Amino acid sequence: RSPWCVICDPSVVLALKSLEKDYLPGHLDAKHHKAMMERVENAVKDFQELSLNEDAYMGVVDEATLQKGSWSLLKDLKRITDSDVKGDLFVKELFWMLHLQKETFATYVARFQKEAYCPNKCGVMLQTLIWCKNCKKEVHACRKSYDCGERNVEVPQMEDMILDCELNWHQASEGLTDYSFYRVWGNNTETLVSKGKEATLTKPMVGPEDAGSYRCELGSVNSSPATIINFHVTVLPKEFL
Ligand SMILES: *[C@@H]1O[C@H](CO)[C@@H](O)[C@H](O)[C@H]1NC(C)=O
């Protein structure tokens, strides 16, 4: 038993309060006002549309999903109020619209869950979620295996080395800082060779001295890195078979 997340949008609560104080007086008999608003409140206080799905309803959305559901509800409600509909027909249309809007919102949430909730496959992604139970907006840590799979990079001698540390979800993550690239030497020391906002390390015209191990770390405002990727560079001399 969980609220319909649209109530966490202030414009929705305002439009609902406006329905009650401004619309009801000229459009529904006074003796029904209390019972209507109770029925509206009950519709908004429970959202069951996703609670028998294979993927359990988690009670969270992102701001994008919230805004899309809210805008869809506000537009449909405004169509009712702009129409100036009254009485029995107004009641029928209002509750029909709320059912439809819950089903529309369910579609948006199932899609958020399937595609946009913690979409990383490794590393730690930070994403702001709104928790529908209390309308709290917080940064959630999407913690996955720190192993992103080692990259085997073979570069012909004299060609350009590109080491790419970017993952598909990095552009969407919160709290990121810099990509640092380290060369990891066989004598158990390391050298920081680049640090900045760029997700790649480029070395033009590679020679043997550029072969070996590299580690990329994408920093976070938190303690742990958002991503660690290891690269092994083999520099292929022309003489190889
Ligand atoms: C460790 O190896 C690196 C790369 O070969 C080199 O720059 C460094 O001087 C070595 N350190 C020692 C103490 O031998």
Query: Residue whose CA is closest, atom 13 of ligand 1?
Result: 187
Ligand 1 atom, smallest distance to 189 CA = 1
Q: 182, 187, 191: which to mutate for ligand 1, most atoms within 8 A of CB?
A: 187
180 forms beta bridges with 195, 217
Query: Tokens at residue 208, please?
Result: 């043997």
> CA–CA separation, 41 vs 67, rounded Å?
20
Q: Which method was used?
A: X-ray
> CA–CA separation, 3 vs 133, rounded Å?
6
- CA distances 179 to 92, 176, 197, 199, 212, Å, are 57, 9, 6, 6, 19
60 forms beta bridges with 131
Report how far ligand 1's centroid is from the alpha carbon of 190 (Å).
9
Note the residue count of the chain: 241
DSSP the chain: ----GGGGSHHHHHHHHHIIIIIHHHHS-GGGHHHHHHHHHHHHH---TTTTSSS---SEE-HHHHHHHHHHHHHHHHHHHHHT--HHHHHHHHHHHHHHHHHHHHHHHHHIIIIISS--SSSEEEEEEEETTTTEEEEEEEE--S----EEEEEETTS-EEEE---TTGGG-SSEEEEEEEEE-TTS-EEEEEEES-SEEEESS--GGG-EEEEEEEEESSSS-SEEEEEEEEEE-TT--
Query: Tokens at residue 136, please?
Result: 């709290």
| Amino acid in the structure at residue 112 | F
The CA dihedral of 163, 169, 170, 176, to the nearest 10 degrees, is -140
Domains belonging to the chain, first-starting first, are: 5-116 (no CATH), 145-236 (2.60.40.10)
Ligand 1 atom, smallest distance to 186 CA = 2
Report how far ligand 1's centroid is from the alpha carbon of 213 (Å).
14
Contacts of 60 (CB under 8 A, 6+ apart): 117, 129, 130, 131, 132, 140
Report the alpha-carbon angle 172-176-180, nearest 5.
120
Question: Do β-strands 176-184 and 136-143 pair in parallel, antiparallel, or remain unpaired?
Answer: unpaired
Resolution of the entry in angstroms: 2.1
Please give all residues whose beta carbon lies within 6 A of any atom in ligand 1, as ranges.
Answer: 185, 187, 189
Phi, psi of 191, rounded to the nearest 5 degrees = -130, 130
Report how far ligand 1's centroid is from the alpha carbon of 187 (Å).
6
Report how far ligand 1's centroid is from the alpha carbon of 211 (Å).
15
The CA dihedral of 202, 208, 212, 214, to the nearest 10 degrees, is -20
**Residue 214's closest CA among 228, 199, 197?**
228
Report how far ligand 1's centroid is from the alpha carbon of 96 (Å).
74
Query: Residue whose CA is closest, atom 12 of ligand 1?
Result: 187
Query: Residue whose CA is closest, atom 1 of ligand 1?
Result: 187
The CA dihedral of 232, 233, 238, 240, to the nearest 10 degrees, is -10
Query: Residue whose CA is closest, atom 3 of ligand 1?
Result: 185
